[PDB]
Amino acid sequence: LNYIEDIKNYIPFNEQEERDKELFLRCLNDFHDILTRDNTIAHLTSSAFAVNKERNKFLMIHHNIYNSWAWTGGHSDNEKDQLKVAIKELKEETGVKNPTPLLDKAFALDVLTVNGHIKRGKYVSSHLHLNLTYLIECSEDETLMLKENSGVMWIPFNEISKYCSEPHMIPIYEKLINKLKTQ
Amino acid sequence: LNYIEDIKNYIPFNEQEERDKELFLRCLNDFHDILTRDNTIAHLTSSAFAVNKERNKFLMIHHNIYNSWAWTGGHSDNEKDQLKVAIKELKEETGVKNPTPLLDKAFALDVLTVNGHIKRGKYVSSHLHLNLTYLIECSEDETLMLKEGVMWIPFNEISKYCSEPHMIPIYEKLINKLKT
Ligand SMILES: [Mn+2]
Ligand SMILES: [Mn+2]
């Protein structure tokens, strides 16, 4: 589903998504390009709410440097199909081969911060990531493998708060689970 | 100095300031206004690099959050003179009586992030702070009292008080520019 209309028609799950969607629209209205990193202020990214058949676990990767786990995802980088971007990043970061989307439109919407940092000698200013999340199922039979991140693992929903140590990301993961739970 | 002129004419100290200044200008171009929280994407804020007479201590404040120490500052909230904003915040947060600015224009420029959070029931989406820092001197003789801890922090141990990894290089920047 085209990102622009998918975003405009997205139905907020809660207040956070209500406010964030509003920011998304302002961006679409104020920037002719929110698809690439040419927009140093904000741009689209996609993430994978990778779950198992039983809908018991959340497939996440262990961030390098930090002893914290997180979902996979990445920059749209001019690829209009956000779902395709989510699938691609999930495959590359976890090693999974045959993930299957369970829904075609965004499953979640979040505006995320990105602190300024240096990448290949280049300083990239602090900015916002307009993240769309996609519901995708993966087989536990899949063979997991890291990407020099430092680990991949199936994380139980009721134990994410114990594996994830990024305070701000917890409520987002919990949101994903609660929403899935209502279906 | 009138912020807009302050911004446009600020001379970058290093690369991050070069890139950050570019983001500031882009905001001036694309955004209706950047002086109030009406702008949910980005808005002007001012901070204080409050230094002691000997220029060896950084007057900072403790955040009951993740046990971290940081500079004083706040939203411009429509006030255009940013030194006045910084001075105001410094007084409020530290209780300093007669702070003395050493420069009449911005001492540093930084684009900072602010994670989405709940403020008195309302959710405030993640956004950016277009921060200007001001060089202000304060006497260690000033009686200091927090507001529901305040402390002068030697430059060489700032990294030991700051729990936000990304703020470390900022403070180091201030301290380096000051040295030169
Ligand atoms: Mn980015
Ligand atoms: Mn703000």
Q: How far apart are CA B128 and CA B125, in angstroms?
A: 10
Q: Is A40 exposed, middle or buried (0-12, 13-18, 19+ CB in 10 A)?
A: middle
Q: Are B100 and B86 in contact (CB under 8 A)?
A: no
Strands A69-70 and A57-62: antiparallel
Q: CA quadruple A71, A87, A7, A178: dihedral positive or negative? A: negative
Report DSSP letters for A76-113, one per residue: -TT-S-HHHHHHHHHHHHH--S--EES-SS-SEEEEEE
CA-based nearest residue to A59, from A180, A170, A160: A160
How far apart CA B32 and CA A37 sit, in angstroms, is 22
CB pairs under 8 A between A and B: 89
The angle at the Cα of B99, spanning B96 to B162, to the nearest 5 degrees, equals: 70
Closest by Cβ to B23, choosing from A31, A113, A125:
A125
Residue type, B122: K
Pick the closest to residue B111 from B34, B32, B63, B42 (CA basis).
B42
| Residue type (1 letter), B107 | F
Question: How was this model experimentally determined?
Answer: X-ray
Q: Which residues of A touch B31 (CB under 8 A)?
A: 30
Angle at B83 between CA B179 and CA B145, to 5 degrees: 85
Across the interface, do B113 and A111 touch by the CB < 8 Å criterion?
A: no
Amino acid, single-letter form, for residue A2: N
Counting ligands in written order, which one lies closest to the CA of residue A35? 1
Question: Which residues of chain B does A114 touch, with a Cβ-Cβ cutoff of 8 Å?
Answer: 113
- B125 and A114 within 8 Å at the Cβ level: the answer is no
The Cβ of residue B180 has, within 10 Å, a number of other Cβ atoms equal to 5
Smallest Cβ–Cβ distance between B40 and the set A15, A26, A117 belongs to A26
Q: Nearest by CB to B15, which of A115, A123, A127?
A: A123
Tokens 């007669």 belong to: B98
Cross-chain Cβ contact A126/B125 below 8 Å: no
Q: Do A127 and B123 touch (CB under 8 A)?
A: no
Contacts of A6 (CB under 8 A, 6+ apart): A82, A105, A106, A132
Measured between alpha carbons, how far is B120 from B37 in angstroms, rounded to an integer? 15
Cα–Cα dist A177/A108, whole Å: 11
Residue of B nearest to A18 (CA): B123
- Residues recorded for chain B: 180
| Chain A residues with CB within 8 Å of chain B CB | 15-16, 18-20, 22-23, 26-27, 30-31, 40-42, 110-117, 123-128, 167-168
Q: In chain A, which residues have their Cβ closer than 8 Å to the Cβ of B113?
A: 113-115, 126-128
List strand residue ranges (DSSP E) for chain A, in order: 42-51, 57-62, 69-70, 72-75, 100-101, 108-114, 117-119, 122-124, 127-137, 152-156
CB A165 within 8 A of CB A113: no
Distance separating alpha carbons of residues A124 and A116, to the nearest angstrom: 5
Nearest to A41 among B23, B40, B126 (CB): B23
Q: Any residues with CB less than 8 A from the CB of B122 and at least 6 apart, and which?
A: A15, A19
Distance CA A134, CA A2 (A): 14
Identify which ligand lies nearest to the alpha carbon of A126. Answer: 1
Instruction: Write out the two tokens for A65.
Output: 């440097």
Resolution of the model in angstroms:
2.2
Q: Is B55 left (phi over 0), alpha (psi -120 to 50) or beta?
A: left
Domains and CATH numbers, chain A: 1-183 (3.90.79.10)
- Mind telling me how many Å the CA of A70 is from chain B's nearest CA? 17
How far apart are the CA of B20 and the centre of ligand 1, in A?
A: 14
Q: Which residues of A touch B30 (CB under 8 A)?
A: 30-31, 41
Among candidates B16, B40, B123 on the partner chain, residue whose Cβ is nearest the Cβ of A16? B123
